[PDB]
Amino acid sequence: APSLWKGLVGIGLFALAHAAFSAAQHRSYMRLTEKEDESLPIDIVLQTLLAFAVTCYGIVHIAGEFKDMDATSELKNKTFDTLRNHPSFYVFNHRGRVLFRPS
Template sequence: MATFCHLIVIAGILGLAHAAFSAAQHRSYIRLTEQEFTRLPADIVLECLLSLIVTCYGVITMAGKFKGIRAMAEFQTKSMDTVGNRPSFYSFAHRGFKKQPEEAKTKNDS
């Protein structure tokens, strides 16, 4: 299944690249014929949108199964102390260790 998803994503990206190349080629053709550029042809726009949808589908399918939105199922077994714990906010490298208390200075001086 993963290989199939990768192939879908690759096909979608190649389609997007082809649509971009076609748009650039159309733009240079318009310049050479000295016509006014109004908009891209419908086939290029359709190819771009279809390739975008195919790429998004492949990426979503490759990501796997989504989790539920409700967090209660995951947090029912945990206490509030473990839920509110944020170890990434712990800070041990602060400037407080450079400032010694007055008692420690007087003991070191004696």
């Protein structure tokens, strides 16, 4: 699912860049002709807005973490058996060591 969102964001960005290039070409043409104070075509403007709205949808989905506020829920599954052992104090005196010693 994240890969699809990333690809969609990339495609939208590419479409936005293409719309920018089209608008640049339109203004370059406009500078050629005297007067003619007209606006850019509405179709490419709508394409620009479509590319802007699509890229803002995946930009929120890509980073969604929203962790739980309460601090009791993560330790709701953890068992006291694992907590009983600690990594500081480890005594290396067990029957498994002499049982696994030959093999």
